[PDB]
Write a protein that binds this ligand. Structure first.
Ligand SMILES: [Mn+3]
Length: 223
């Protein structure tokens, strides 16, 4: 449902969107496979398809050519670059989307990810210094690059919602995410995705089967 991978300098080459084709500015232009999300992304003037060069700049804290974030206070290879929140659809749902080509499923999946992303924003914090003392500021803004993967084979519909390690403070300064609230809310975020997906599917008219034991769902008549 939800997996959270912490990306650092040690595992960066495994992050979604790290590689791209030289000829292309975008990974997939004129489609919904990628998109910028979050209030931080909008504050940066970012929306629609994700430009690979920009994604990679933000990955390593490059707000712009004159503005590189300092997030390293300790071993430099330990610096967190971001968090991959991977939202995976139930198996029957993936089958309906990928094996039956049901575009409605894709849309509901996207809505559910957007909803979970918005909930994630509530948990965004940054350290600051009021008057000599340190205080945690609720910033309510994230920069997120999302990449949808449609793996036809054992069907697996999921989206990588990559949360940059940054948030915009009240003073306009970009600082590292204080990830504590995010990390202890992994289960909550996963349930938000699950609930919104069920809600959207139900609204479209789909019959869903509920598993009381572990409080999950999947398409009625399907894995
Ligand atoms: Mn993937």
């Amino acid at each position: 449902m939800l997996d959270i991978t912490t990306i650092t300098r040690q595992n960066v080459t495994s992050v979604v969107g790290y590689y791209s084709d030289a000829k292309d500015d975008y990974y997939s232009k004129d489609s919904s496979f990628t998109s910028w999300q979050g209030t931080g992304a909008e504050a940066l003037g970012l929306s629609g398809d994700v430009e690979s060069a920009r994604f990679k700049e933000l990955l390593v804290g490059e707000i712009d050519t004159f503005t590189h974030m300092q997030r390293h206070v300790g071993d430099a290879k330990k610096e967190r670059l971001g968090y991959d929140l991977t939202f995976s659809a139930p198996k029957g749902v993936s089958m309906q989307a990928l094996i039956h080509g049901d575009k409605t499923i894709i849309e509901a999946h996207e809505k559910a990810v957007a909803a979970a992303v918005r909930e994630a924003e509530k948990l965004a914090q940054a350290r600051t210094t009021r008057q000599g003392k340190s205080v945690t500021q609720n910033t309510n803004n994230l920069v997120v690059a999302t990449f949808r993967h449609e793996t036809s084979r054992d069907p697996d519909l999921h989206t990588h919602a990559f949360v940059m390690n940054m948030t915009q403070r009240e003073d306009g300064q970009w600082r590292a995410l204080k990830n504590d609230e995010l990390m202890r809310n992994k289960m909550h975020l996963g349930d938000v995705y699950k609930q919104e997906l069920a809600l959207e599917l139900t609204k479209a008219g789909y019959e869903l089967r509920y598993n009381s034991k572990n409080n999950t769902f999947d398409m009625a008549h399907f894995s």
